[PDB]
C-alpha cells in the first residue's frame, strides 16, 4: 500500500 | 436453535433481525450510519443495533471485521461499548455475509454535547475523564484504537460515556497500517513516521476532542494533508533540529524546513477563559514529540480530574491475544474465523 503523505509533501515543495 | 427473523427496509438498506428486536428506528434519521434503536422484548432493554457495513467487502475490511468482533468480545469496561448480542441471518457459513451487533441504547454522541450551550467545565472534566479511563484500560490490553473522534463516543442521559467503534483497532505492533485515524484527529507522526506510530496517537486524538469540547470548534479542520500539517504546526510550533531527526520521511522534513518558523503557542492564549488546569493538560496532550506526550494513566492523575480520580477504580485489562491476525488471509478465511466468533458468542447475564 502506497504512502499518500509523501506524494503531497513532494508536490508541495515542487 | 435459530430464532424467527423478519425483514424491513430502513433508509435504502435491508435489515433482517430476530423477532425479539422490535420497532427498529434509525438514530438521527440515519445520519449516524447503520445503527437503529430497538426494544428487546426478550429482556425489556432499549438497545442499539448496528448492522456492520459491508463486512467482507475486501481482505482489509474482512480483517477489520474480525478484529473488531474479537476485541468487543474480549473487553469488559464501563467506558467501552459492550455486546449484549451478536447475530447473523445466515443459516450457514456458505451464505454468511452480514453481521449485527447489539448494545445498550445511549441516545447521543459527543458531537451533540459539543453543541450544548449549557456545557460546564465540570462536564468537560467528567467526559474527558471517562475517555481516559477507557483508554487506560484499552492500552493496558496492548490494544490501540486509532480512530477516536466525537462521533465514536456515545453519551447517555447521565453523561456516562462509552468509546464506540473498534473497526480500526488492533493489537499494537512495531509496524502497523499506515493510513489510519480520521484526518482532523490524526496525530502528526502518522504522517511523518509512516507505519511506525504507537498508542500515543490515541492521546493526540483525546487532546483534539477536549479542545473541541472547550471551544465548540474543530481544532485542526484541515482540507488536505499539507493543510492539516500546517494547522498543527501553527499551534505546537515547527520542530527543532533534534526533533526533525526523528521524522522518517525525507520529503516531509524537506517540506517542513521550507515553512516559516513557528514557535509553540501559549495555549492559555488560544483557549481563552478555560480552566487553567485544562489548558495545562492540553499542553501535555498536544505535543509534537510523541515520546513526551502524557499517557492515559498519567492523565487520570492530573489535577484537572481531582473530583473524579480514584486510583483503585481505574482498572486495567487482561492483555489481548492475537489469534489469527498476524498473517495475510483470504476473505473466506476471515469469514470462517468471524462466523466462529459469531456462533460462539455468549450473552452476558441480565
Ligand atoms: O445510542 C447511540 C449509539 C449506540 C450504539 C452505537 N454503535 C454500536 C456499537 C456496538 C453495538 F454492539 C451496537 C451499536 F449499535 C452507536 C450509537 C451512535 C450514538 C448515538 C447518537 C444518537 C442516538 O439517538 C439520537 C436520537 O435519534 C435523536 O436524534 C443514539 C446513539
Residue numbers in the entry:
A (entry chain B): 88 to 101
B (entry chain A): 4 to 353
Extract from the study:
Activating transcription factor 2 (ATF2) is ubiquitously expressed in most cell types and regulates the transcription of various genes involved in a broad spectrum of cellular functions: cell growth, development and stress. Mitogen-activated protein kinases (MAPK) control transcription by phosphorylating TADs. In the present study, we explore the structural and mechanistic basis of ATF2 regulation by two MAPKs: JNK and p38. We showed that JNK and p38 bind to the ATF2 TAD through distinct regions.
We also determined the crystal structure of the pp-p38:ATF2(83–102)_S90N complex. This structure revealed that the FENEF motif adopts an α-helix which is wedged in-between the N-terminal half of αG and one of the α-helices from the so-called MAPK insert (α2L14). The bulky hydrophobic side-chains of F92 and F96 are buried at the FRS pocket that forms only in pp-p38 when the activation loop is double-phosphorylated and W197 (located in the αEF/αF loop) is flipped out from its original position. This explains why ATF2 binding to p38 depends on the activation state of the kinase. Apart from direct contacts between pp-p38 and the SPFENEF motif, there are helix capping interactions that stabilize the α-helical conformation of α2L14, αG, and the ATF2 helix itself by involving glutamate (E93, E95) or the S/N90 side-chains. An asparagine at this position mediates stronger binding (by about 5-fold) compared to a serine, while phosphorylation at Ser90 abolishes binding. Phosphorylation at S90 is sterically detrimental. The MAPK FRS pockets are overall similar but residues corresponding to W197 of p38 are different in ERK2 (serine) and JNK1 (methionine), thus ERK2 or JNK1 cannot form the FRS pocket required for ATF2 SPFENEF motif binding.
